Write a protein that binds this ligand. Structure first.
Ligand SMILES: *[C@@]1(O)C[C@@H](C(=O)O)C[C@@H](O)[C@@H]1O
Ligand SMILES: *[C@@]1(O)C[C@@H](C(=O)O)C[C@@H](O)[C@@H]1O
Lengths: 252, 252
């Protein structure tokens, strides 16, 4: 296991780390959210850039990043543009997606970026290399908002992210049955027991999948997402309740 | 599904019901525990009769039952002699075990009894019939403190309890790996999806199995055990923490 340490937070040891997502459509909204969010207790701040409407302007995006970092100078900050293809709010070109991510890396304002595995292997690998050259870690991600692949498929997908240089592979899948929630936990455990080179983040979405957001410590998900006021994906619960549960499990 | 209603508690609907176990070695200890326990919040009181040292005297046992019922007149009360064979504190003859259980049934003091499946089919069936004739429900139970059977084996075991007249089949198994915890959840879910005639109580014991004590509502365990001060089996957590988690899951 190669853990990932950002600002004295160690991802891949101990209790799963709590991530919340900041979703602001504009600069004033981001400012207000950053001020509210700094009164919540959590480990990593994810900025969901795809909710930001002025995405065409790299400098507008960087100005918003700076608002966030100034509000919270000591928080690990993950920059995530979630494409609509994978359940986010809007669509941009692959070239603009890579530009925004490289700009984020160059800014020194963010500690981690999210790169979607299915952006394409060559582009992902080159951007991973860029991030690493600039001391930024990569959460490499995949989402299936329709269904849950087989456990074997999910393991192979996470392994491929590892092969491409991901610091932290991530997969989120939509259950169509309670059995699908167990499949996701099965794949998670298989990584912990047999492919434990990198911390992984896994979740089964929606109400049915909520237990996957709580059981990270036993089956091997290194982080989990909670909601401050609004969920950034189906199934997230209130961040304070998430924290209560994690602590009870850790101390059981 | 045929639910079981005891004193306006419906077992097999809604949130899993919280059971705590009273373990007193003697009459004064039982008295003190009943007084402390009535200041805890839970749904069903289990009296672990096997911790009671004066087990040879049916009347001593009935006197202790009455202490409990007087302290808590409105609580569902489950009378459980757990044999040492299945992880309890002492051993008695099969005939004395059946005598104590029939005495409990006859007393009108208890709402439910526990009968161990492996006492023997004919004796179990006859005692189930006796309980039913006297308006007492049966939790039929099995414990494996060494290992976890296969999911198929656990389902067949629970189905056999149903066939013998159990109102509520119960199985507790010891994980030797995290995979074994998923096996127990798998068997639980199979009952909910395919053999949903009776509420079932399931658990994977020990620290590793704790998630099974929390996830009853999604995968289909109708009750879960918490500790007031001391656990009555490995893996139980503090009853207040158990309740916090159940409520968060129910409302997620
Ligand atoms: C990630 O895709 C996980 C999501 C979830 O909680 O299912 C939340 C997203 O904001 C995050 O990027
Ligand atoms: C049952 O055997 C379940 C046990 C557990 O919590 O694993 C507790 C016992 O007291 C009860 O009878």
């Amino acid at each position: 296991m190669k853990t990932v340490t950002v600002k004295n937070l160690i991802i891949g040891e101990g209790m799963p780390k709590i991530i919340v997502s900041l979703m602001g459509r504009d600069i004033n909204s981001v400012k207000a959210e950053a001020l509210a969010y700094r009164e919540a207790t959590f480990d990593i701040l994810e900025w969901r850039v795809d909710h930001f409407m002025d995405i065409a302007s790299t400098q507008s995006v960087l100005t918003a990043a700076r608002v966030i970092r100034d509000a919270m100078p000591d928080i690990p900050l993950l920059f995530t543009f979630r494409s609509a293809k994978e359940g986010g709010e809007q669509t941009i070109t692959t070239q603009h997606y890579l530009t925004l991510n490289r700009a984020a890396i160059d800014s020194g304002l963010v500690d981690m970026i999210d790169l979607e595995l299915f952006t394409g292997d060559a582009d992902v690998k080159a951007t991973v290399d860029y991030a690493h050259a600039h001391n930024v870690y990569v959460v490499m991600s995949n989402h299936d908002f329709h269904q849950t692949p087989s456990a074997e498929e999910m393991v192979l997908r996470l392994r491929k992210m590892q092969a491409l240089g991901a610091d932290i592979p991530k997969i989120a899948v939509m259950p169509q049955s309670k059995h699908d929630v167990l499949t996701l936990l099965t794949a998670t455990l298989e990584m912990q027991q047999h492919y434990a080179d990198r911390p992984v983040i896994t979740m089964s979405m929606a109400k049915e999948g909520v237990i996957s957001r709580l059981a990270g410590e036993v089956f091997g998900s290194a982080a989990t997402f909670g909601a401050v006021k609004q969920a950034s994906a189906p199934g997230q619960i209130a961040v304070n309740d998430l924290r209560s549960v994690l602590m009870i499990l850790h101390n059981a």
